[PDB]
Amino acid sequence: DLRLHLLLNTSVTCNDGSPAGYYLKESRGSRRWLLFLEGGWYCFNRENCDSRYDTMRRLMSSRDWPRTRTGTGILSSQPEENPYWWNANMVFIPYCSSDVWSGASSKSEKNEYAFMGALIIQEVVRELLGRGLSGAKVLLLAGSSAGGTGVLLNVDRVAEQLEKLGYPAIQVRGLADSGWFLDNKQYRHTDCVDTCAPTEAIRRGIRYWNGVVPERCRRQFQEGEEWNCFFGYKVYPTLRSPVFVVQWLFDEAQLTVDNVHLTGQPVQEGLRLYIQNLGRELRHTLKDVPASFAPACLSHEIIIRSHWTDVQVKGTSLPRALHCWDRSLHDTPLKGCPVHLVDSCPWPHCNPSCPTGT
Numbered sequence: 488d489l490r491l492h493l494l495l496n497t498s499v500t501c502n503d504g505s506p507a508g509y510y511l512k513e514s515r516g517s518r519r520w521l522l523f524l525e526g527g528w529y530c531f532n533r534e535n536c537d538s539r540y541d542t543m544r545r546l547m548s549s550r551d552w553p554r555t556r557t558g559t560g561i562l563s564s565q566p567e568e569n570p571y572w573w574n575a576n577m578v579f580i581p582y583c584s585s586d587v588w589s590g591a592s593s594k595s596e597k598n599e600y601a602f603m604g605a606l607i608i609q610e611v612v613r614e615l616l617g618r619g620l621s622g623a624k625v626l627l628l629a630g631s632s633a634g635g636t637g638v639l640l641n642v643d644r645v646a647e648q649l650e651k652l653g654y655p656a657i658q659v660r661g662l663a664d665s666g667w668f669l670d671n672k673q674y675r676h677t678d679c680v681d682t683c684a685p686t687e688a689i690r691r692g693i694r695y696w697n698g699v700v701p702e703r704c705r706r707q708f709q710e711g712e713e714w715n716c717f718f719g720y721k722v723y724p725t726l727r728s729p730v731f732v733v734q735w736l737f738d739e740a741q742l743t744v745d746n747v748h749l750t751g752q753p754v755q756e757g758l759r760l761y762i763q764n765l766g767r768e769l770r771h772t773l774k775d776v777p778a779s780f781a782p783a784c785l786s787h788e789i790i791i792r793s794h795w796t797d798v799q800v801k802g803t804s805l806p807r808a809l810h811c812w813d814r815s816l817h818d819t820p821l822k823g824c825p826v827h828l829v830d831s832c833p834w835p836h837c838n839p840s841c842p843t844g845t
């Protein structure tokens with residue numbers, strides 16, 4: 488169990504102005520800190536945020552948050568469930584800003600909602616420094632789905648924050664799970680009414696949230712084009728902190744935004760080629776990502792699932808690959824301890840270790 492702490496700086500808020508927060512389980516005698524960013528899509532205008540407030544309010548407000556949460560997967564403290572970092576200090580940061588962790592805007596006279604995702608991360612880090620993070624050797628900023636994209640948008644800012652605060656010895660790293668999307672053509676075309684094309688949704692959200700992106704990526708794409716930095720293959724090469732990328736090759740959220748709804752019905756030639764081309768494109772974007780884990784499965788999210796240890800690429804599990812990554816960052820490849828694990832087979836579930844969906 489991780490225990491809730493609402494932020495002492497109550498100016499840093501969820502969408503509705505309630506205080507943001509974090510869940511913490513300390514492990515003193517460990518100098519490893521895992522800060523995990525929850526996912527859960529986003530909202531990008533008044534109407535769709537209002538809808539989200541009605542039926543997904545925990546993603547917009549802390550008013551109903553429970554006092555504890557159970558750490559699962561990479562957040563578990565049991566070695567049996569978490570071979571990788573079971574003894575680390577664990578932090579789960581609830582996603583209550585609906586902005587892919589990019590926002591820097593308060594609720595105000597002009598703003599019905601606050602979008603403070605980027606500031607929530609900074610404030611969590613700041614308040615944790617007084618709770619033991621000041622003694623850290625490694626801070627791994629991890630996240631799934633929108634939280635995985637949030638890692639890509641925020642890992643270098645956390646590094647800069649710690650450097651400016653006088654902690655240059657803390658090694659900041661990122662683990663982005665299921666947040667590496669393609670701005671590809673949809674299988675069928677819709678107008679962005681709610682299934683919005685990748686690019687159109689983000690372009691509107693950034694203006695609505697006052698969204699912020701990493702500085703080097705912002706300088707490349709420049710004013711009006713910062714939406715590009717929400718796409719992993721474009722933002723990743725601009726980052727300086729080590730980032731391990733976990734991405735199913737046939738991610739269900741990617742297929743959803745591509746208007747592919749796998750019905751169980753037979754798959755025709757056009758859709759077969761579309762799906763195979765998606766896998767090949769994702770694989771291609773990971774070719775020069777040295778720390779990656781990309782199984783050929785139709786699924787979504789990995790790292791906080793209790794059975795996250797089960798999937799393997801080329802016989803190596805994700806917890807093992809992450810351990811190999813840790814070794815590779817000690818102060819040349821490692822015999823039998825790989826970090827770059829991308830399936831080459833071309834169809835969902837061609838890897839026998841894929842999640843069953845049971």
Ligand SMILES: CC(=O)n1cc(Cl)c2c(Cl)c(C)ccc21
Nearest residue numbers: 528632633636668685717740744
């Ligand atoms: C599932 C989710 O929260 N997502 C966050 C971002 Cl960003 C994103 C993108 Cl860019 C695509 C194309 C699809 C899903 C996405």
Ligand SMILES: *[C@@H]1O[C@H](CO)[C@@H](O)[C@H](O)[C@H]1NC(C)=O
Nearest residue numbers: 496497498499606607609610
């Ligand atoms: C609270 O957070 C805001 C936004 O980051 C910051 O401007 C302000 O100085 C903080 N207040 C305190 C007391 O740290």
